[PDB]
């Protein structure tokens, strides 16, 4: 209880899970969901379907606060990242606008061995 009816819907996709955080017009989180918050536990969290449920769960949890419209912020290139958008669109919540804001360094820290090579 706090009533907002307009805020941010941050999607955090990765090759291992998707996770949505909904906030107020100032960035403070109201509710969130993820592949784990829903039943999935292993690699199923990174599933595009997982993303869907996770997104929808958060939409509902936010609807409960009077949330009606929200701006979307995409981050990462995980699977089921578009499915997370898609969901938020059909989640009753009005999707005011999508914006990909994934961070990318201008080259700073040496990546883990798993992430090395370029060009």
């Amino acid at each position: 209880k706090r009533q907002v009816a307009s805020g941010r819907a941050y999607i955090h996709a990765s090759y291992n899970n998707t996770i949505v955080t909904i906030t107020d017009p100032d960035g403070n989180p109201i509710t969130w969901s993820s592949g784990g918050v829903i039943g999935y536990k292993g690699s199923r969290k990174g599933t595009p379907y997982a993303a869907q449920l996770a997104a929808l769960d958060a939409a509902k949890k936010a609807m409960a606060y009077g949330m009606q419209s929200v701006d979307v912020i995409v981050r990462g290139t995980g699977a089921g990242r578009e499915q997370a958008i898609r969901a938020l669109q059909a989640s009753g919540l009005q999707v005011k606008s999508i914006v990909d804001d994934t961070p990318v360094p201008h080259n700073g820290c040496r990546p883990k061995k798993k992430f090395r090579k370029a060009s």
């Binding site: 958008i85 999508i98 914006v99 990909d100 804001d101």
Partner: protein
């Protein structure tokens, strides 16, 4: 294929060395605050090279962006 118009042809005489003309410099950045390629800027290697330098100056001054958020998607 880098179609559409060229950022240069679509402009008049300008000082590729003036790091303060935020209006014309701005024209060479992408939707993101990224510096466009020769394929798009329609500049010469020598010119493009001078741009990069000036643009970088305007960014440090505060006159130009280092990176912007991608709208729509």
């Amino acid at each position: 294929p880098s179609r559409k118009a060229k950022v240069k042809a679509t402009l008049g005489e300008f000082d590729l060395r003036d790091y303060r003309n935020v209006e014309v410099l701005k024209r060479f950045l992408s939707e993101t605050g990224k510096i466009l390629p020769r394929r798009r800027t329609g500049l010469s290697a020598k010119e493009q090279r001078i741009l990069a330098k000036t643009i970088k100056r305007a960014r440090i001054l505060g006159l130009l962006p280092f990176t912007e958020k991608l709208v729509r998607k």
